[PDB]
Design a binder for this molecule. Sequence first.
Ligand SMILES: O=c1ccn([C@@H]2O[C@H](COP(=O)(O)OP(=O)(O)O)[C@@H](O)[C@H]2O)c(=O)[nH]1
Ligand SMILES: [Mn+2]
Length: 241
Amino acid sequence: GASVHKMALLVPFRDRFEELLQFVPHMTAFLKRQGVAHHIFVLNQVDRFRFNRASLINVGFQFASDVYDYIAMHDVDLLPLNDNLLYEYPSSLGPLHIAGPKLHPKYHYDNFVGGILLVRREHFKQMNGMSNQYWGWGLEDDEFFVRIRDAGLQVTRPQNIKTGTNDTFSHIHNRYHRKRDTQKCFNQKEMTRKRDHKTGLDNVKYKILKVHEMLIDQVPVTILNILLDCDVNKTPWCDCS
Ligand SMILES: O=c1ccn([C@@H]2O[C@H](COP(=O)(O)OP(=O)(O)O)[C@@H](O)[C@H]2O)c(=O)[nH]1
Ligand SMILES: [Mn+2]
C-alpha cells in the first residue's frame, strides 16, 4: 500500500478557455507518461479587478486538499515539449522551476521563476505563499524569488536538458490576442517594486462563489470561481479605470 506524492496543478485563469482546451489533454498525457499523480484546479478570477496571478495561486493552495503534498503554479499557455522535464516532488533545497531561463521561449534572466514552478506544501506555507499586492502583469514571481531566498531556500532546475529556448516549450500566446496588462496607476510602480512583508497566504481576502466539476474528454478538472477582494486604501491599482 505504498504512498505516492500528489501534485495540485494550480492554473491562474481568466478568459483563456481556448488555451485551457489545449492545456488539459496535453498535461494529462504528459504527466501520465511520467507517472505523476495530480489534479488540475482552474483558478477562475470572477471579480472585476485586474488579473492577480499570485493571489489566485494563494486561493488555490488554500482550497486544495492536504493530500496534495506539492503544487505546480502553472500558466495555462505554456506546454512542456520535452519528457525529461520531470514534474517531480521537489527536494529539500526548495522549489523546482520547470520553465528555466535557459528553456523559456521569452524570459531569460537568471532568477526568473515564472511560468511553471513546483513547490512543496511546507515550503509554500513557510514562505506565507505569494504576495497579494500584484494586480496586473509583472513582478509577483520576482518577489516570490526573494521570499525563497529569505526562507533560506534555493531554486533547483532540470539538469542536462538538451533542448533550448526554441524547442522546450510551446508558448502559444500572441501579445495582441492576449494582451498583457502593464498599466500603472496610483503609485503602483514604486509600491510593487518593494519586497512585501505584510501580505500573503495568511491574509488573502476572497470568496469562492462556486466550485464546478468539469470533464474534458473524460479528464476531470475542478473550476474555482474566485472573487478576490481589493482594499483600495492599500492597493488601489487593482483597478486603473
Ligand atoms: O488575463 C489573464 C492574464 C493571465 N492569465 C494566466 O496567467 C498566466 C501568465 O500570464 P501571461 O501569459 O500574460 O504571462 P507571460 O506570457 O508574460 O509569462 C497565463 O498563461 C494564464 O494562465 C489569464 O488566465 N488571464
Ligand atoms: Mn503567456
